[PDB]
Amino acid sequence: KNSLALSLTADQMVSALLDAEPPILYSEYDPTRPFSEASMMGLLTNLADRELVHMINWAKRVPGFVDLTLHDQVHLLECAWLEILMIGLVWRSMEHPGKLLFAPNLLLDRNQGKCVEGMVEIFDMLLATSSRFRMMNLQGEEFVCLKSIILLNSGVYTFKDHIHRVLDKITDTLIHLMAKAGLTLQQQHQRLAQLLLILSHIRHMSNKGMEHLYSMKCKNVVPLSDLLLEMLDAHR
Amino acid sequence: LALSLTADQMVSALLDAEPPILYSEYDPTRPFSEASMMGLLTNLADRELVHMINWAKRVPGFVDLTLHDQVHLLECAWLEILMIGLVWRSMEHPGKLLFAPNLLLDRNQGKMVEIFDMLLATSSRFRMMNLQGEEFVCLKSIILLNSGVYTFSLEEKDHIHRVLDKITDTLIHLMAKAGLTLQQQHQRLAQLLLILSHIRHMSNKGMEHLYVPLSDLLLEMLDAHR
Amino acid sequence: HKILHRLLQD
Amino acid sequence: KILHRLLQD
Ligand SMILES: CCN(c1ccc(Cl)cc1)S(=O)(=O)[C@@H]1C[C@@H]2O[C@H]1C(c1ccc(O)cc1)=C2c1ccc(O)cc1
Ligand SMILES: CCN(c1ccc(Cl)cc1)S(=O)(=O)[C@H]1C[C@H]2O[C@@H]1C(c1ccc(O)cc1)=C2c1ccc(O)cc1
């Protein structure tokens, strides 16, 4: 059973991924800047729930993902969802130094982070990632390659060849983008490595964020949706 | 200093810096409880950390950093580094973890088994890719320099990033020397670096599992993550 | 029966 | 910190 994904050109892969992009969603329109754990996480849980539905339908459009069994699809999304939410957050925060653009109408500064126990540490990590992407002049085409790598890679060792072939195709596509941008051969492999090492950082943030979400669950602070609870429970 | 080495010189430097493989106190004629087995592994890890600290000083670029930054990088990376070492020496032991030459365990020994399965999976991945010793020492140095770099002045970080670029160059050099096409080189580079995301995951899940007797040094390494 | 299983279906 | 010290040796 040969997969269509492996037959795409680099340009077709990029086009597919750009076309699959979810929209940027809004938070609620109440002006009140959240400063409490309850108001903050109320907004974030609502936003994330809505983003998850778009994420699931985005994943179906990532070339190669459809070729997996439903069980494998479930596992990869369970593993990767918070990483994917986070890399999206860091991407849309790039042009807002020192701030996190959770939504166009929900821009937080780290001051609001300090008013939630456990949050500033992750806040700073996310800010550092955004700044790093900004200084690297990360392009949209590169971003969607990275997000797809997170989807396919983060659960692949907790299960095979098909996923690795698709990952290889995305590596090819990244290098293609860098060559198209005029990078020298040395610059291409150096940039590839820089980007993939940031993914270790994104994994780290997701790990710590997930622990905080579990603390959230146990404290019964904010009402959590059943979808979120099931996605979170996959990491217990 | 680190920025002047050729790729071959970098590989030689890292190979010569390798820590020794230490023995455990395991005794097959002695019964072990979950507590005493953890004790064995604690004792082993604690002794390894001493060798790891001296190894770190020989990783090109590391001594150029301030003491406070050296401490931070080792606090961040030590469990990842123990783990990648474990996975490396377990490669040729399918289904088992070679904690020491005299301590080879498979998964039905545990009580943890979640982490063990992940370590086994990583070892299998290395084996399938036929990971080379020269590649392994490059990866281990990347962990040391990379894992703590985004949680630390800005100059110190730029220098680390320059050394990390050289290690990337060195990896590509090795793969080209092994006859890989340029496309194969870039693919293999990516395969190797993505495994680092899983090693980070394993380290964090291990800490989470720990929230086990602990040495004075381990205790301090741990609080750094809590 | 996971919600995600339902949502991943057409 | 012990790590601090062992690094100085
Ligand atoms: C509780 C579970 N883990 C863990 C244990 C202790 C600490 Cl401090 C942190 C984690 S683990 O992650 O499974 C952790 C991975 C592996 O198996 C546990 C352990 C270890 C390490 C230190 C120690 O004092 C006791 C055991 C391991 C280990 C030990 C030596 C190595 O060269 C490599 C790995
Ligand atoms: C600094 C942000 N982070 C954070 C860490 C610790 C605490 Cl205590 C609070 C927040 S986070 O981990 O990134 C991350 C956890 C929490 O905030 C961020 C976040 C989030 C991230 C991206 C996104 O597009 C939407 C939401 C959260 C969220 C909340 C509720 C949900 O149901 C789902 C997700």
The span from the CA of C5 to the CA of A70, in Å, is: 7
In 10 A of CB B16, how many CB atoms? 9
User: Burial code of B52-84, b = ≥16 C-beta within 10 A, e = fewer?
Assistant: bbebbeebbbbeebeeebbbbbbbbbbbbbbbb
Q: Number of Cβ pairs closer than 8 Å across A and B?
A: 95
Nearest to B133 by CA among B169, B97, B187, B92: B92
> CA–CA separation, B168 vs B138, rounded Å?
8
Beta-bridge partner residues of B105: B97
Nearest to B100 by CA among B124, B74, B116, B82: B82
Q: How many other CB atoms are there within 10 angstroms of residue A65's CB atom?
A: 23
Q: Is B80 in the pocket of ligand 1 (CB under 6 A)?
A: no
CA A54 to chain CA mean position, Å: 12
Nearest-angstrom CA–CA distance, A30 and A22: 24
Residue type, A149: I
CA distances from A164 to A2, A64, A153, A158, B214 (A): 14, 10, 8, 14, 39
Quick one: A115 exposed, middle or buried, by C-beta within 10 A (0-12, 13-18, 19+)? middle
A236 labeled part of a ligand binding site:
no
Q: Which residues of B are annotated as a binding site?
A: 48, 89, 209
B151 contact residues in A (CB cutoff 8 A) = 124-125, 128
- D3 close to B220: Cβ distance less than 8 angstroms: yes
- How far, in Å, CA of A109 to CA of A222, rounded? 22
Q: Do D8 and B67 touch (CB under 8 A)?
A: yes
Neighbours of A110 (CB within 10 A): 15
Q: Which residues form the domain of A149?
A: 1-236
For chain D, the straight-line distance linking the first and the last C-alpha, in angstroms and rounded, comes to 13
* Three-state secondary structure string covering chain B: CHHHCCHHHHHHHHHHCCCCCCCCCCCCCCCCCHHHHHHHHHHHHHHHHHHHHHHHCCCCCHHHCCHHHHHHHHHHHHHHHHHHHHHHHCCCCCCEEEEECCEEEECCCCCCHHHHHHHHHHHHHHHHHCCCHHHHHHHHHHHHHHCCCCCCCHHHHHHHHHHHHHHHHHHHHHHHHCCCCHHHHHHHHHHHHHHHHHHHHHHHHHHHHHCCCCCHHHHHHHHCCC
Instruction: Give me ligand 2 centre to Cα A139, in Å.
Output: 24
In total, how many domains does chain B have? 1
Q: Residue A10 sits in a domain of what CATH number?
A: 1.10.565.10
Residue of B nearest to D7 (CA): B53
Residue ID of nearest Cα to ligand 2 atom 27: A44
**CA nearest to A166, candidates A71, A69, A65, A72:** A65
Interatomic CA distance for residues A235 and A150, integer angstroms:
16
Instruction: Return phi, psi of residue A3, to 5°.
Output: -90, 135
Q: Which uninterrupted H or E stretch holds A74?
A: helix A70-92
Dig out the tokens for B210 from the structure.
Answer: 């720990």
Coil, helix or strand at residue A41:
helix
Q: Which residue has the tokens 């800490």?
A: B207
Question: In 3-state terms, chain D is what percent helix, strand and coil (to 5)?
Answer: 80, 0, 20
Find where tokens 């008013």 sit.
Answer: A115
**Whole-number Å distance between alpha carbons of B217 and B47:** 10
A135 with A144: CB under 8 angstroms? no
**Which residue numbers come right before each break in chain B (C to N over 2.5 Å)?**
111, 152, 211
Instruction: Compute, in angstroms, the gap from residue B115 CA to the centroid of ligand 2.
Output: 25
Question: CA nearest B222: which of B88, B46, B24?
Answer: B46
Residue B61 dihedral angles phi and psi, to the nearest 5°:
100, -30
From CA B174, how far away is CA A106, in angstroms rounded? 47
With a CB cutoff of 8 Å and minimum separation 6, the contacts of B208 are A207, A211
To the nearest whole Å, the CA of B143 is away from the closest chain A CA by 9
Contacts of B82 (CB under 8 A, 6+ apart): B45, B48, B49, B52
Closest by CA to A194, choosing from B153, B161, B159, is B161
SS3 (DSSP) at A72: helix
Long-range contacts, stretch A218-222, CB < 8 angstroms, 24+ apart = A221/A37, A221/A38, A221/A41, A222/A38, A222/A41, A222/A42, A222/A45
The C-alpha angle with vertex A185 and arms to B186 and B153, in degrees rounded to 5, equals 90
Chain centre to alpha carbon of residue A97? 19
CB atoms under 10 Å from CB of A15, counted, come to: 13
Q: Which two tokens stand for residue A151?
A: 């989807």
Q: Could you count the other beta carbons within 10 Å of the beta carbon of residue B36?
A: 13
List residues bridging with A212 in a β-sheet: none
Whether D and B touch, i.e. at least 3 CB pairs below 8 A, reads as yes
Question: Taking a C-beta distance cutoff of 8 angstroms, is the pair B10, B167 a contact?
Answer: yes
> Which tokens hold the place of A128?
């550092």
Q: Whose CA is nearest to atom 25 of ligand 1?
A: B42
Alpha-carbon distance values, A38 to A148, A224, B64 (Å): 32, 12, 45
C-alpha A141 chain-centroid distance: 14
Query: Is beta strand B103-106 parallel, antiparallel or unpaired with respect to B96-100?
Result: antiparallel
Q: Whole-angstrom Cα distance, residue A112 to residue B77? A: 30
What lies within 8 Å, CB to CB, of A147 at 6+ separation is: A84, A87, A88
CA distance B143 to B145: 6
Helix axes A185-219 and B182-210, enclosed angle (nearest 10): 20
Residue B218 token pair: 């381990």
B180 is written with which tokens? 């890989």
A212 is known to lie in a ligand binding site: yes
A14, A53, A154, C5, C7 from A73: Cα distances, Å? 21, 14, 12, 9, 11
Q: Name the amino acid, one letter, at A221.
A: V
Unique residue bearing structure tokens 């289904």: B95
Which residue intervals of A93-160 are DSSP H helices?
A: 110-113, 119-135, 140-153
Residue type, A134: R
Q: Which residues of D touch B220 (CB under 8 A)?
A: 1-3
| A12 CB-near residues (< 8 Å, 6+ apart) | none
| Cα B100 to middle of ligand 2, angstroms | 40
Q: In chain A, what is the straight-line distance between the N-terminal and C-terminal CA atoms, in Å? A: 35
